[PDB]
């Protein structure tokens, strides 16, 4: 059952396998040069993760090169253990809201990159992800999933609270805030911005290489990034592939008119006092 | 389909996920002090693995403490990688027949322990294991599974060829040959023998600690050894538990009379000239 798999932890709905040993995450020891990549699920984490890795490097699965902090499935999968054995400088992936991130990261003043995507398109991507994950109950319908999304009753909680809290943290010059739609409409600009934030020289050669290797077509056929290195028993891509469409606007093919009006109205009430600038 | 999952490799039927990157196994680098624990599937590997580990520690999931050499599932599970990162002295688990084991192990003259169990009881245990593994097609019936077993058309091939080849290897004083039924009927004797082979003192305190910790009842309740640390999506124990019965003679509850006669007759022709001494039961 849905609520046998997921349960509220400190006001955030979470996969119980990731909170059973919460102590390991809360007491995590950060290093001054650690870099944190944070996102709400299905906002382009894999895309920006590969861009940053390439920058660091001017085959092994991406989930091995950049460990997923809080991911845990008893003794078979353990992100914390992977990080303890990782040589510096480490790149750390996470989907946690600011109130749940290990305090050591703030204490040590580590650099961080937060990426977001428009809410309607995130909901479409998340719906298919639940179908893909074998141990996650399939929603009875897209609409039923959207009602849960609006209530923040999906893994990692409310998208609204997630974006608002990370936007506030981005007041800090060491926390970079970025958008999926900006990477889609002006990739060269976003890559140069990332190279500069990480204190490196943006050369035409480096910038072109990254733009070339990180296209959706490129990443969909790279076994290291398309998640085919992860067993079908856990993630069945026969049901739905990880690199699905990679576009802006798929909400137009899933949201009936009545539902869209209610969602957009709800969005307004939620994001009233937030200054974040999403692309038109 | 059965043969979409399994394929013959150098005359041995194998899970294709374990042979896709065979080069990683063939070129494996052994160390002089490595210890190899080899068995045909479902013969008591987990039981003897825990006994040996306890000996090393003189009184974390078992698949992490003692890596399964050839086990591989793309980038999620990789026994070779685990071993490269393991501090010595390493304990290595494997289900491979002698002709498929990495040659480096023979070149370095490493010590090894081989364990076997009577064929009829192994077939019963193996049948339930296929039901347990989610990605393995469930046999249509026990009899159909037995026909495949007699033909060597099950993962890791012919049980007959496996036992005969390892028995020949045991001529070497550094390769110990043992039986599941001997551990069941005379555990203290078998434990003292293992402590001595690994060059340690079989004190009364030590022997007694091992015997109590490795009973079927204890291990069935120990999350480290009962394979509950492995996701149900891969191994569903709701279908059949890993620590199933742990007895001698369950074949009597599965083999119809007609089938048993044919199996035993076939066994005779396969093992006619083998001097191996199985226990009377
Ligand atoms: N190089 C790339 N360019 C564009 N979209 C990409 C991409 N790599 C991944 N994506 C998209 O990012 C989403 C997955 O996000 P995450 O990595 O956070 O889980 C998917 O969205 P869609 O389901 O809409 O296709 C996927 O197709
Ligand atoms: N401490 C113990 N004592 C007796 N049998 C044990 C045991 N631990 C495991 N077993 C048995 O060993 C078999 C599993 O073997 P392996 O470890 O090689 O996969 C199972 O046989 P059954 O299915 O007949 O019960 C299991 O119950
Ligand atoms: C860890 C699992 C595989 C990886 C899955 C994943 C992988 C990547 C990601 O960004 C989010 C998630 C959420 C659910 C995870 C799954 C829960 C059960 C499964 O074993
Ligand atoms: C590696 C798997 C889990 C562990 C299983 C195992 C575990 C222990 C063992 O002695 C043999 C086997 C054979 C099949 C394996 C399975 C094949 C698919 C699954 O992911």
mmCIF file of N, CA, C and O in Angstrom, chain A residues 34-40 48 51-52 55-56 94 98 106 109-117 162-163 165-180 182-183 187 189-200 276:
data_model
loop_
_atom_site.group_PDB
_atom_site.id
_atom_site.type_symbol
_atom_site.label_atom_id
_atom_site.label_comp_id
_atom_site.label_asym_id
_atom_site.label_seq_id
_atom_site.Cartn_x
_atom_site.Cartn_y
_atom_site.Cartn_z
ATOM 1 N N UNK A 34 33.597 20.064 -0.331
ATOM 2 C CA UNK A 34 32.477 19.266 -0.852
ATOM 3 C C UNK A 34 31.556 20.203 -1.684
ATOM 4 O O UNK A 34 31.399 21.382 -1.337
ATOM 5 N N UNK A 35 30.960 19.696 -2.765
ATOM 6 C CA UNK A 35 30.011 20.496 -3.551
ATOM 7 C C UNK A 35 28.659 19.765 -3.504
ATOM 8 O O UNK A 35 28.589 18.569 -3.794
ATOM 9 N N UNK A 36 27.595 20.473 -3.133
ATOM 10 C CA UNK A 36 26.273 19.859 -3.063
ATOM 11 C C UNK A 36 25.377 20.255 -4.240
ATOM 12 O O UNK A 36 25.231 21.438 -4.549
ATOM 13 N N UNK A 37 24.798 19.251 -4.898
ATOM 14 C CA UNK A 37 23.860 19.450 -6.010
ATOM 15 C C UNK A 37 22.496 19.000 -5.460
ATOM 16 O O UNK A 37 22.271 17.802 -5.225
ATOM 17 N N UNK A 38 21.599 19.965 -5.242
ATOM 18 C CA UNK A 38 20.271 19.700 -4.695
ATOM 19 C C UNK A 38 19.146 20.006 -5.679
ATOM 20 O O UNK A 38 19.197 21.014 -6.390
ATOM 21 N N UNK A 39 18.122 19.146 -5.696
ATOM 22 C CA UNK A 39 16.961 19.309 -6.587
ATOM 23 C C UNK A 39 15.711 18.631 -6.052
ATOM 24 O O UNK A 39 15.794 17.725 -5.214
ATOM 25 N N UNK A 40 14.547 19.070 -6.526
ATOM 26 C CA UNK A 40 13.312 18.386 -6.169
ATOM 27 C C UNK A 40 13.327 17.299 -7.255
ATOM 28 O O UNK A 40 13.825 17.537 -8.353
ATOM 29 N N UNK A 48 22.394 18.252 -15.106
ATOM 30 C CA UNK A 48 23.377 19.159 -14.504
ATOM 31 C C UNK A 48 24.515 18.447 -13.760
ATOM 32 O O UNK A 48 25.606 19.000 -13.600
ATOM 33 N N UNK A 51 27.145 17.779 -16.432
ATOM 34 C CA UNK A 51 27.810 19.032 -16.828
ATOM 35 C C UNK A 51 28.914 19.377 -15.808
ATOM 36 O O UNK A 51 30.063 19.640 -16.176
ATOM 37 N N UNK A 52 28.566 19.348 -14.522
ATOM 38 C CA UNK A 52 29.521 19.656 -13.454
ATOM 39 C C UNK A 52 30.698 18.675 -13.395
ATOM 40 O O UNK A 52 31.834 19.076 -13.156
ATOM 41 N N UNK A 55 33.156 19.521 -15.986
ATOM 42 C CA UNK A 55 33.906 20.720 -15.632
ATOM 43 C C UNK A 55 35.083 20.324 -14.735
ATOM 44 O O UNK A 55 36.221 20.751 -14.948
ATOM 45 N N UNK A 56 34.808 19.484 -13.741
ATOM 46 C CA UNK A 56 35.849 19.020 -12.826
ATOM 47 C C UNK A 56 36.958 18.296 -13.600
ATOM 48 O O UNK A 56 38.141 18.421 -13.277
ATOM 49 N N UNK A 94 21.585 15.177 -3.736
ATOM 50 C CA UNK A 94 20.502 15.096 -2.744
ATOM 51 C C UNK A 94 19.167 15.686 -3.237
ATOM 52 O O UNK A 94 19.150 16.539 -4.142
ATOM 53 N N UNK A 98 16.018 22.231 2.684
ATOM 54 C CA UNK A 98 17.043 22.747 3.614
ATOM 55 C C UNK A 98 16.983 22.292 5.075
ATOM 56 O O UNK A 98 18.025 22.040 5.683
ATOM 57 N N UNK A 106 26.264 23.375 6.129
ATOM 58 C CA UNK A 106 26.092 24.811 6.383
ATOM 59 C C UNK A 106 27.260 25.293 7.242
ATOM 60 O O UNK A 106 27.868 26.331 6.968
ATOM 61 N N UNK A 109 30.319 25.928 5.391
ATOM 62 C CA UNK A 109 30.141 26.906 4.310
ATOM 63 C C UNK A 109 30.387 26.365 2.893
ATOM 64 O O UNK A 109 30.887 27.099 2.031
ATOM 65 N N UNK A 110 30.011 25.105 2.645
ATOM 66 C CA UNK A 110 30.212 24.465 1.336
ATOM 67 C C UNK A 110 29.424 25.123 0.206
ATOM 68 O O UNK A 110 28.324 25.642 0.427
ATOM 69 N N UNK A 111 29.983 25.093 -1.005
ATOM 70 C CA UNK A 111 29.298 25.642 -2.178
ATOM 71 C C UNK A 111 28.165 24.682 -2.545
ATOM 72 O O UNK A 111 28.277 23.467 -2.337
ATOM 73 N N UNK A 112 27.081 25.216 -3.094
ATOM 74 C CA UNK A 112 25.939 24.396 -3.486
ATOM 75 C C UNK A 112 25.269 24.925 -4.761
ATOM 76 O O UNK A 112 25.319 26.125 -5.057
ATOM 77 N N UNK A 113 24.660 24.010 -5.513
ATOM 78 C CA UNK A 113 23.937 24.351 -6.737
ATOM 79 C C UNK A 113 22.522 23.764 -6.624
ATOM 80 O O UNK A 113 22.371 22.553 -6.428
ATOM 81 N N UNK A 114 21.501 24.620 -6.738
ATOM 82 C CA UNK A 114 20.103 24.186 -6.697
ATOM 83 C C UNK A 114 19.449 24.391 -8.074
ATOM 84 O O UNK A 114 19.549 25.475 -8.650
ATOM 85 N N UNK A 115 18.787 23.354 -8.595
ATOM 86 C CA UNK A 115 18.119 23.443 -9.896
ATOM 87 C C UNK A 115 16.632 23.136 -9.780
ATOM 88 O O UNK A 115 16.228 22.201 -9.073
ATOM 89 N N UNK A 116 15.809 23.933 -10.460
ATOM 90 C CA UNK A 116 14.361 23.722 -10.459
ATOM 91 C C UNK A 116 13.772 23.731 -11.890
ATOM 92 O O UNK A 116 14.450 24.107 -12.847
ATOM 93 N N UNK A 117 12.515 23.312 -12.013
ATOM 94 C CA UNK A 117 11.815 23.194 -13.297
ATOM 95 C C UNK A 117 10.338 23.582 -13.066
ATOM 96 O O UNK A 117 9.828 23.452 -11.950
ATOM 97 N N UNK A 162 9.659 23.320 -0.990
ATOM 98 C CA UNK A 162 11.024 22.969 -1.402
ATOM 99 C C UNK A 162 11.702 24.131 -2.147
ATOM 100 O O UNK A 162 12.823 24.548 -1.815
ATOM 101 N N UNK A 163 11.017 24.658 -3.159
ATOM 102 C CA UNK A 163 11.540 25.765 -3.965
ATOM 103 C C UNK A 163 11.662 27.065 -3.160
ATOM 104 O O UNK A 163 12.688 27.748 -3.225
ATOM 105 N N UNK A 165 12.026 27.529 0.128
ATOM 106 C CA UNK A 165 13.097 27.469 1.124
ATOM 107 C C UNK A 165 14.490 27.527 0.508
ATOM 108 O O UNK A 165 15.379 28.194 1.042
ATOM 109 N N UNK A 166 14.703 26.831 -0.606
ATOM 110 C CA UNK A 166 16.011 26.873 -1.252
ATOM 111 C C UNK A 166 16.272 28.250 -1.919
ATOM 112 O O UNK A 166 17.424 28.685 -2.029
ATOM 113 N N UNK A 167 15.205 28.933 -2.341
ATOM 114 C CA UNK A 167 15.344 30.261 -2.951
ATOM 115 C C UNK A 167 15.872 31.215 -1.868
ATOM 116 O O UNK A 167 16.752 32.032 -2.123
ATOM 117 N N UNK A 168 15.348 31.093 -0.652
ATOM 118 C CA UNK A 168 15.783 31.941 0.455
ATOM 119 C C UNK A 168 17.257 31.711 0.779
ATOM 120 O O UNK A 168 17.991 32.655 1.067
ATOM 121 N N UNK A 169 17.690 30.457 0.741
ATOM 122 C CA UNK A 169 19.081 30.118 1.025
ATOM 123 C C UNK A 169 20.018 30.690 -0.041
ATOM 124 O O UNK A 169 21.174 31.015 0.243
ATOM 125 N N UNK A 170 19.516 30.816 -1.267
ATOM 126 C CA UNK A 170 20.325 31.330 -2.368
ATOM 127 C C UNK A 170 20.715 32.805 -2.237
ATOM 128 O O UNK A 170 21.343 33.365 -3.139
ATOM 129 N N UNK A 171 20.351 33.428 -1.120
ATOM 130 C CA UNK A 171 20.727 34.815 -0.867
ATOM 131 C C UNK A 171 22.240 34.799 -0.693
ATOM 132 O O UNK A 171 22.918 35.790 -0.961
ATOM 133 N N UNK A 172 22.750 33.655 -0.235
ATOM 134 C CA UNK A 172 24.180 33.443 -0.009
ATOM 135 C C UNK A 172 24.908 33.342 -1.354
ATOM 136 O O UNK A 172 24.462 32.631 -2.259
ATOM 137 N N UNK A 173 26.021 34.056 -1.489
ATOM 138 C CA UNK A 173 26.773 34.035 -2.742
ATOM 139 C C UNK A 173 27.359 32.658 -3.056
ATOM 140 O O UNK A 173 27.773 32.394 -4.189
ATOM 141 N N UNK A 174 27.378 31.775 -2.059
ATOM 142 C CA UNK A 174 27.919 30.436 -2.257
ATOM 143 C C UNK A 174 26.867 29.383 -2.610
ATOM 144 O O UNK A 174 27.181 28.205 -2.729
ATOM 145 N N UNK A 175 25.620 29.810 -2.781
ATOM 146 C CA UNK A 175 24.535 28.910 -3.166
ATOM 147 C C UNK A 175 23.938 29.411 -4.489
ATOM 148 O O UNK A 175 23.217 30.399 -4.496
ATOM 149 N N UNK A 176 24.239 28.721 -5.593
ATOM 150 C CA UNK A 176 23.751 29.091 -6.937
ATOM 151 C C UNK A 176 22.348 28.528 -7.256
ATOM 152 O O UNK A 176 22.107 27.340 -7.067
ATOM 153 N N UNK A 177 21.440 29.380 -7.750
ATOM 154 C CA UNK A 177 20.067 28.974 -8.084
ATOM 155 C C UNK A 177 19.888 28.979 -9.613
ATOM 156 O O UNK A 177 20.151 29.993 -10.261
ATOM 157 N N UNK A 178 19.444 27.855 -10.182
ATOM 158 C CA UNK A 178 19.274 27.729 -11.639
ATOM 159 C C UNK A 178 17.969 27.062 -12.115
ATOM 160 O O UNK A 178 17.296 26.379 -11.333
ATOM 161 N N UNK A 179 17.625 27.259 -13.398
ATOM 162 C CA UNK A 179 16.388 26.708 -13.989
ATOM 163 C C UNK A 179 16.577 25.781 -15.207
ATOM 164 O O UNK A 179 17.385 26.059 -16.097
ATOM 165 N N UNK A 180 15.785 24.710 -15.249
ATOM 166 C CA UNK A 180 15.812 23.726 -16.340
ATOM 167 C C UNK A 180 15.517 24.385 -17.700
ATOM 168 O O UNK A 180 16.184 24.104 -18.693
ATOM 169 N N UNK A 182 16.074 27.416 -18.600
ATOM 170 C CA UNK A 182 17.145 28.311 -19.019
ATOM 171 C C UNK A 182 18.229 27.470 -19.708
ATOM 172 O O UNK A 182 18.872 27.926 -20.662
ATOM 173 N N UNK A 183 18.435 26.244 -19.220
ATOM 174 C CA UNK A 183 19.415 25.329 -19.819
ATOM 175 C C UNK A 183 18.903 24.881 -21.208
ATOM 176 O O UNK A 183 19.688 24.679 -22.145
ATOM 177 N N UNK A 187 21.699 27.229 -23.412
ATOM 178 C CA UNK A 187 22.724 26.370 -22.833
ATOM 179 C C UNK A 187 24.139 26.963 -22.709
ATOM 180 O O UNK A 187 24.782 26.819 -21.668
ATOM 181 N N UNK A 189 25.091 29.968 -22.281
ATOM 182 C CA UNK A 189 25.115 30.926 -21.191
ATOM 183 C C UNK A 189 25.158 30.263 -19.817
ATOM 184 O O UNK A 189 25.923 30.671 -18.948
ATOM 185 N N UNK A 190 24.332 29.243 -19.623
ATOM 186 C CA UNK A 190 24.277 28.542 -18.341
ATOM 187 C C UNK A 190 25.573 27.786 -18.029
ATOM 188 O O UNK A 190 26.001 27.729 -16.870
ATOM 189 N N UNK A 191 26.202 27.212 -19.055
ATOM 190 C CA UNK A 191 27.453 26.478 -18.857
ATOM 191 C C UNK A 191 28.577 27.423 -18.450
ATOM 192 O O UNK A 191 29.359 27.111 -17.546
ATOM 193 N N UNK A 192 28.663 28.580 -19.107
ATOM 194 C CA UNK A 192 29.698 29.567 -18.780
ATOM 195 C C UNK A 192 29.513 30.050 -17.340
ATOM 196 O O UNK A 192 30.489 30.265 -16.625
ATOM 197 N N UNK A 193 28.257 30.222 -16.929
ATOM 198 C CA UNK A 193 27.925 30.656 -15.572
ATOM 199 C C UNK A 193 28.398 29.630 -14.529
ATOM 200 O O UNK A 193 28.924 30.001 -13.476
ATOM 201 N N UNK A 194 28.201 28.344 -14.825
ATOM 202 C CA UNK A 194 28.623 27.272 -13.919
ATOM 203 C C UNK A 194 30.154 27.169 -13.824
ATOM 204 O O UNK A 194 30.701 26.962 -12.738
ATOM 205 N N UNK A 195 30.843 27.306 -14.957
ATOM 206 C CA UNK A 195 32.300 27.241 -14.974
ATOM 207 C C UNK A 195 32.889 28.363 -14.116
ATOM 208 O O UNK A 195 33.864 28.160 -13.397
ATOM 209 N N UNK A 196 32.281 29.543 -14.186
ATOM 210 C CA UNK A 196 32.740 30.691 -13.411
ATOM 211 C C UNK A 196 32.464 30.561 -11.916
ATOM 212 O O UNK A 196 33.301 30.926 -11.099
ATOM 213 N N UNK A 197 31.294 30.035 -11.558
ATOM 214 C CA UNK A 197 30.939 29.852 -10.152
ATOM 215 C C UNK A 197 31.918 28.875 -9.492
ATOM 216 O O UNK A 197 32.266 29.031 -8.317
ATOM 217 N N UNK A 198 32.373 27.879 -10.250
ATOM 218 C CA UNK A 198 33.305 26.888 -9.722
ATOM 219 C C UNK A 198 34.755 27.345 -9.863
ATOM 220 O O UNK A 198 35.686 26.562 -9.664
ATOM 221 N N UNK A 199 34.932 28.618 -10.208
ATOM 222 C CA UNK A 199 36.251 29.223 -10.353
ATOM 223 C C UNK A 199 37.182 28.610 -11.397
ATOM 224 O O UNK A 199 38.313 28.222 -11.083
ATOM 225 N N UNK A 200 36.716 28.536 -12.640
ATOM 226 C CA UNK A 200 37.530 28.003 -13.720
ATOM 227 C C UNK A 200 37.438 28.902 -14.939
ATOM 228 O O UNK A 200 36.551 29.749 -15.037
ATOM 229 N N UNK A 276 11.100 34.391 -6.945
ATOM 230 C CA UNK A 276 11.750 33.553 -7.959
ATOM 231 C C UNK A 276 11.272 33.884 -9.377
ATOM 232 O O UNK A 276 10.073 34.070 -9.597
#
